Design an enzyme around this catalytic site. Structure first.
Site, PDB file in Angstrom:
ATOM      1  N   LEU A  22       0.890  -1.184   0.000  1.00  0.00           N
ATOM      2  CA  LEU A  22       0.000   0.000   0.000  1.00  0.00           C
ATOM      3  C   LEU A  22       0.919   1.222   0.000  1.00  0.00           C
ATOM      4  O   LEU A  22       1.981   1.033   0.593  1.00  0.00           O
ATOM      5  CB  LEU A  22      -0.843  -0.080   1.284  1.00  0.00           C
ATOM      6  CG  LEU A  22      -2.150  -0.803   1.384  1.00  0.00           C
ATOM      7  CD1 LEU A  22      -3.106  -0.567   0.250  1.00  0.00           C
ATOM      8  CD2 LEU A  22      -1.967  -2.339   1.296  1.00  0.00           C
ATOM      9  N   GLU A  30      -9.024   0.903   8.692  1.00  0.00           N
ATOM     10  CA  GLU A  30      -9.388   0.858   7.234  1.00  0.00           C
ATOM     11  C   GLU A  30      -9.417  -0.611   6.918  1.00  0.00           C
ATOM     12  O   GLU A  30     -10.259  -1.170   6.180  1.00  0.00           O
ATOM     13  CB  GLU A  30      -8.495   1.832   6.461  1.00  0.00           C
ATOM     14  CG  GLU A  30      -8.971   2.085   5.073  1.00  0.00           C
ATOM     15  CD  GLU A  30      -9.242   1.065   4.016  1.00  0.00           C
ATOM     16  OE1 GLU A  30      -8.293   0.279   3.689  1.00  0.00           O
ATOM     17  OE2 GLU A  30     -10.276   0.859   3.436  1.00  0.00           O
TER      18      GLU A  30
HETATM   19  N1  NDP Z   1      -5.188  -0.206  -1.831  1.00  0.00           N
HETATM   20  C1  NDP Z   1      -5.959  -1.106  -2.343  1.00  0.00           C
HETATM   21  O1  NDP Z   1      -7.147  -1.093  -2.330  1.00  0.00           O
HETATM   22  C2  NDP Z   1      -5.305  -2.248  -3.086  1.00  0.00           C
HETATM   23  C3  NDP Z   1      -3.934  -2.204  -3.089  1.00  0.00           C
HETATM   24  N2  NDP Z   1      -3.299  -3.233  -3.787  1.00  0.00           N
HETATM   25  C4  NDP Z   1      -1.750  -3.161  -3.936  1.00  0.00           C
HETATM   26  O2  NDP Z   1      -1.717  -2.980  -5.461  1.00  0.00           O
HETATM   27  C5  NDP Z   1      -0.764  -3.965  -5.979  1.00  0.00           C
HETATM   28  C6  NDP Z   1      -1.298  -5.212  -6.700  1.00  0.00           C
HETATM   29  O3  NDP Z   1      -1.469  -4.706  -7.973  1.00  0.00           O
HETATM   30  P1  NDP Z   1      -1.709  -5.144  -9.575  1.00  0.00           P
HETATM   31  O4  NDP Z   1      -0.354  -4.932  -9.963  1.00  0.00           O
HETATM   32  O5  NDP Z   1      -2.575  -4.186 -10.078  1.00  0.00           O
HETATM   33  O6  NDP Z   1      -1.994  -6.676  -9.439  1.00  0.00           O
HETATM   34  P2  NDP Z   1      -2.896  -7.933  -9.592  1.00  0.00           P
HETATM   35  O7  NDP Z   1      -3.044  -8.299  -8.246  1.00  0.00           O
HETATM   36  O8  NDP Z   1      -4.124  -7.552 -10.316  1.00  0.00           O
HETATM   37  O9  NDP Z   1      -1.872  -8.891 -10.433  1.00  0.00           O
HETATM   38  C7  NDP Z   1      -1.802  -9.017 -11.895  1.00  0.00           C
HETATM   39  C8  NDP Z   1      -1.676 -10.583 -12.024  1.00  0.00           C
HETATM   40  O10 NDP Z   1      -2.798 -11.108 -11.838  1.00  0.00           O
HETATM   41  C9  NDP Z   1      -3.407 -11.930 -12.817  1.00  0.00           C
HETATM   42  N3  NDP Z   1      -4.590 -11.391 -13.421  1.00  0.00           N
HETATM   43  C10 NDP Z   1      -4.998 -10.111 -13.199  1.00  0.00           C
HETATM   44  N4  NDP Z   1      -6.070  -9.795 -13.845  1.00  0.00           N
HETATM   45  C11 NDP Z   1      -6.425 -11.021 -14.472  1.00  0.00           C
HETATM   46  C12 NDP Z   1      -7.565 -11.509 -15.431  1.00  0.00           C
HETATM   47  N5  NDP Z   1      -8.539 -10.613 -15.709  1.00  0.00           N
HETATM   48  N6  NDP Z   1      -7.543 -12.667 -15.879  1.00  0.00           N
HETATM   49  C13 NDP Z   1      -6.542 -13.447 -15.481  1.00  0.00           C
HETATM   50  N7  NDP Z   1      -5.487 -13.173 -14.747  1.00  0.00           N
HETATM   51  C14 NDP Z   1      -5.504 -11.898 -14.219  1.00  0.00           C
HETATM   52  C15 NDP Z   1      -2.158 -12.080 -13.791  1.00  0.00           C
HETATM   53  O11 NDP Z   1      -1.339 -13.032 -13.220  1.00  0.00           O
HETATM   54  P3  NDP Z   1      -0.276 -13.840 -14.358  1.00  0.00           P
HETATM   55  O12 NDP Z   1       0.721 -12.841 -14.614  1.00  0.00           O
HETATM   56  O13 NDP Z   1       0.125 -14.872 -13.341  1.00  0.00           O
HETATM   57  O14 NDP Z   1      -1.212 -14.287 -15.393  1.00  0.00           O
HETATM   58  C16 NDP Z   1      -1.571 -10.687 -13.653  1.00  0.00           C
HETATM   59  O15 NDP Z   1      -0.051 -10.664 -13.782  1.00  0.00           O
HETATM   60  C17 NDP Z   1       0.121  -4.309  -4.686  1.00  0.00           C
HETATM   61  O16 NDP Z   1       0.951  -3.119  -4.737  1.00  0.00           O
HETATM   62  C18 NDP Z   1      -0.946  -4.380  -3.612  1.00  0.00           C
HETATM   63  O17 NDP Z   1      -0.383  -4.297  -2.312  1.00  0.00           O
HETATM   64  C19 NDP Z   1      -3.956  -4.283  -4.412  1.00  0.00           C
HETATM   65  C20 NDP Z   1      -5.287  -4.339  -4.440  1.00  0.00           C
HETATM   66  C21 NDP Z   1      -6.148  -3.366  -3.699  1.00  0.00           C
HETATM   67  C1  MOT Z   2      -3.582  -5.182  -0.337  1.00  0.00           C
HETATM   68  N1  MOT Z   2      -4.848  -5.744   0.210  1.00  0.00           N
HETATM   69  C2  MOT Z   2      -5.899  -4.949  -0.413  1.00  0.00           C
HETATM   70  C3  MOT Z   2      -6.507  -3.885   0.490  1.00  0.00           C
HETATM   71  C4  MOT Z   2      -5.926  -3.299   1.552  1.00  0.00           C
HETATM   72  O1  MOT Z   2      -6.689  -2.500   2.019  1.00  0.00           O
HETATM   73  C5  MOT Z   2      -7.741  -2.457   1.419  1.00  0.00           C
HETATM   74  N2  MOT Z   2      -8.732  -1.563   1.729  1.00  0.00           N
HETATM   75  C6  MOT Z   2      -9.760  -1.622   0.905  1.00  0.00           C
HETATM   76  N3  MOT Z   2     -10.791  -0.786   1.208  1.00  0.00           N
HETATM   77  N4  MOT Z   2      -9.729  -2.338  -0.143  1.00  0.00           N
HETATM   78  C7  MOT Z   2      -8.837  -3.189  -0.457  1.00  0.00           C
HETATM   79  N5  MOT Z   2      -9.157  -3.853  -1.574  1.00  0.00           N
HETATM   80  C8  MOT Z   2      -7.808  -3.291   0.365  1.00  0.00           C
HETATM   81  C9  MOT Z   2      -4.994  -6.390   1.427  1.00  0.00           C
HETATM   82  C10 MOT Z   2      -3.971  -6.632   2.225  1.00  0.00           C
HETATM   83  C11 MOT Z   2      -4.018  -7.293   3.387  1.00  0.00           C
HETATM   84  C12 MOT Z   2      -5.211  -7.699   3.912  1.00  0.00           C
HETATM   85  C13 MOT Z   2      -5.417  -8.295   5.131  1.00  0.00           C
HETATM   86  O2  MOT Z   2      -4.573  -8.732   5.868  1.00  0.00           O
HETATM   87  N6  MOT Z   2      -6.675  -8.522   5.576  1.00  0.00           N
HETATM   88  C14 MOT Z   2      -7.074  -9.123   6.844  1.00  0.00           C
HETATM   89  C15 MOT Z   2      -7.121  -7.860   7.795  1.00  0.00           C
HETATM   90  C16 MOT Z   2      -7.428  -8.183   9.255  1.00  0.00           C
HETATM   91  C17 MOT Z   2      -6.904  -6.988  10.037  1.00  0.00           C
HETATM   92  O3  MOT Z   2      -6.300  -6.119   9.432  1.00  0.00           O
HETATM   93  O4  MOT Z   2      -7.013  -7.050  11.238  1.00  0.00           O
HETATM   94  C18 MOT Z   2      -8.452  -9.658   6.702  1.00  0.00           C
HETATM   95  O5  MOT Z   2      -9.067 -10.532   7.370  1.00  0.00           O
HETATM   96  O6  MOT Z   2      -9.032  -9.169   5.746  1.00  0.00           O
HETATM   97  C19 MOT Z   2      -6.279  -7.456   3.104  1.00  0.00           C
HETATM   98  C20 MOT Z   2      -6.190  -6.808   1.898  1.00  0.00           C
END
Ligand code: NDP
Ligand code: MOT
EC number: 1.5.1.3
Length: 186
Positions: A22, A30
């Protein structure tokens, strides 16, 4: 089976991640909100399914993997089997939703939650049907390497309120963020 929803936490510059994690320091309530929304099922004897991409999975501390009380599906085209801890692996989002309708899971899953990454969001987003986006707005800028795609306000309406989601400005470790819910049907 039930509802298809996305949940994301995004900074003011639309950032969701940086070097595998993150872009901001950890925000404990959060995280709590992420877990309460994804884990609560609306029907007894059912569970929510959470769909993520491979780097989303690996971004979760190994000790909280798989997310407990949830059916964990990993999206991947390179992997042969689900990674250790994961319950399911699919090569695309349709295959993932096609599996929901398999007697396997069909009587088991209430809601379906997409938790990341951008490619998965971009796709759930243009997918057809009823969709809700649960967006936590982190109100500042944070250096990111990965971003959330653009919400089209001609298709998604920001809701005025939603039951169980605080409408006022939260604040932690000195960062202010607020929770939003948008809905689509097209
Ligand atoms: N703040 C938030 O809400 C969130 C934060 N994050 C953070 O963002 C990052 C993760 O990001 P991102 O890079 O976008 O990664 P993804 O988690 O979406 O990874 C991409 C991998 O996932 C697979 N994949 C994704 N979309 C598809 C599809 N439609 N069909 C099939 N395979 C798919 C492929 O794997 P392959 O290459 O193996 O085919 C692709 O390389 C981390 O930095 C994480 O900590 C992540 C989610 C939520
Ligand atoms: C990078 N992601 C995505 C993520 C982080 O924060 C978010 N916040 C929102 N609103 N959306 C998301 N999709 C995420 C994640 C990373 C770690 C956990 C995680 O440990 N989750 C535990 C959290 C329990 C806790 O924090 O105590 C769980 O049960 O979900 C989840 C999501």
């Amino acid at each position: 089976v039930g509802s298809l929803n996305c949940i994301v936490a995004v900074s003011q510059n639309m950032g969701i991640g940086k070097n595998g994690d993150l872009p901001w320091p950890p925000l404990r309530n959060e995280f709590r909100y992420f877990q309460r929304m994804t884990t609560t099922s609306s029907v007894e004897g059912k569970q929510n399914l959470v769909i993520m991409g491979k780097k989303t999975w690996f971004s979760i501390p190994e000790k909280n993997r798989p997310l407990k009380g949830r059916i964990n599906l990993v999206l991947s085209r390179e992997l042969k089997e689900p990674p250790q801890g994961a319950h399911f692996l699919s090569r695309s989002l349709d295959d993932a939703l096609k599996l929901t309708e398999q007697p396997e899971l069909a009587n088991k899953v209430d809601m379906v939650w997409i938790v990341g990454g951008s490619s998965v969001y971009k796709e759930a987003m243009n997918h057809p049907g009823h969709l809700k986006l649960f967006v936590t707005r982190i109100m500042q800028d944070f250096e990111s390497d990965t971003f959330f795609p653009e919400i089209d306000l001609e298709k998604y309406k920001l809701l005025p309120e939603y039951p169980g989601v605080l409408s006022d400005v939260q604040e932690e470790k000195g960062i202010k963020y607020k929770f939003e819910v948008y809905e689509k049907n097209d």
